[PDB]
Amino acid sequence: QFAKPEDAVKYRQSAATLMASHFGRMTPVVKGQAPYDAAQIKANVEVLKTLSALPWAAFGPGTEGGDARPEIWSDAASFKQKQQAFQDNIVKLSAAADAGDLDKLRAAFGDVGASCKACHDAYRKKK
Amino acid sequence: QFAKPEDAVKYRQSAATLMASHFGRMTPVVKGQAPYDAAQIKANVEVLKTLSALPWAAFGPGTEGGDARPEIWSDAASFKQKQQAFQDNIVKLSAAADAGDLDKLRAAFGDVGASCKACHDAYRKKK
Ligand code: HEC
Ligand code: HEC
Ligand SMILES: O=C1O[C@H]([C@@H](O)CO)C(O)=C1O
Ligand SMILES: O=C1O[C@H]([C@@H](O)CO)C(O)=C1O
């Protein structure tokens, strides 16, 4: 869907920005600093679910640029595993949110976070 | 969810970027220049549905900035109508995509487009 590689860069960075907001906005809830409303969280995690599937199609062949490390493309199987682990952890978060269980939510949230960070540590350029 | 107004600006502009991609990528299909795969379009419009609901919560009080015209806030009822008309047109697009009817899809797509443009013409600063 991208006319130039710059377009794929812009897309994935915007998807990431939205992921970051929908993930990170739950921090006060999982820490107990904001109230836990199960329905609010269930709806927000549904949004995060959708967003979570979006970036990966914008690292298509030839879309090198931004803060994407070239190893995304030369180590494609390894990058796919990081992405799939992340998306699997999103499924678990969806289950925790759907169950309405704050304990489970905080543990699932921590697993998602660690998956975001694992990928960045390997495949995102230092800033 | 935004620590500073700049954060809401960044969020809404990223949501818009994603909307633009998920909307605009269907142009070749509605024009007949790319093949129409009903399932592909149904799935893409589902993504657009989700995205389409996101920007409006990031024009909260005090989030003036970016290319948002101040009239968004001083004419709140009028801006809400533009947004609701847009979202209603997204519903119609969802129905057309769900029905698998290219005729209906192209007419619904044109209505959504016109709603995007109507809002921009009133509430987005010239660039
Ligand atoms: C690899 C499988 C990743 C996972 C999982 C996550 N992110 Fe990511 N992120 C990744 C890359 C390769 C990049 C760089 C993209 C580029 O071309 O520059 C990013 C970038 C971000 C950013 C910065 C985006 C920007 O606006 O420039 C953010 C804020 C970000 N990523 C957040 C984020 C979160 C919250 C994740 C888990 C919920 C997450 N990423 C997962 C690679 C991967
Ligand atoms: C009012 C109800 C709007 C509707 C409906 C749509 N858009 Fe929008 N858009 C709106 C505003 C007020 C702004 C400016 C936001 C800011 O703070 O700068 C925008 C911006 C865009 C942009 C540019 C985003 C950027 O990256 O800077 C795009 C590409 C855009 N809008 C696209 C778009 C599309 C495709 C829409 C219909 C599917 C659409 N917008 C609707 C206000 C409104
Ligand atoms: O909110 C975020 O969480 C991850 C990471 O910090 C979790 O450790 C990330 O990169 C964000 O923007
Ligand atoms: O793809 C887009 O469609 C609308 C508008 O051009 C429709 O007229 C818009 O602002 C986009 O980015």
Residue numbers in the entry:
A (entry chain A), B (entry chain A): 1 to 127
Provide the publication's sentences verbatim.
Cytochromes c′ occur in methanotrophic, denitrifying and photosynthetic bacteria and have proposed roles in protection against nitrosative stress, NO trafficking during denitrification or pathogen defence. All cytochromes c′ have a 4 α-helix bundle structure containing a heme centre with a solvent exposed proximal His ligand and a buried hydrophobic distal pocket with a non-coordinated residue (Leu or Phe, rarely Met or Tyr) in a position to exert steric influence on the binding of diatomic gases. Unusually, cytochromes c′ are able to utilize both heme faces (distal and proximal) as a means of discriminating NO from other diatomic gases. In order to understand the factors controlling distal versus proximal NO coordination, we have examined NO binding to AXCP variants in which the occluding distal residue Leu16 is replaced with residues that are smaller (Ala, Val), of comparable size (Ile) or larger (Phe).
TRIR data for the L16A variant have been described previously. Indeed, recent molecular dynamics simulations of geminate CO-rebinding in wt and L16A AXCP suggest that propionate conformation is a key determinant of distal AXCP-ligand affinity.
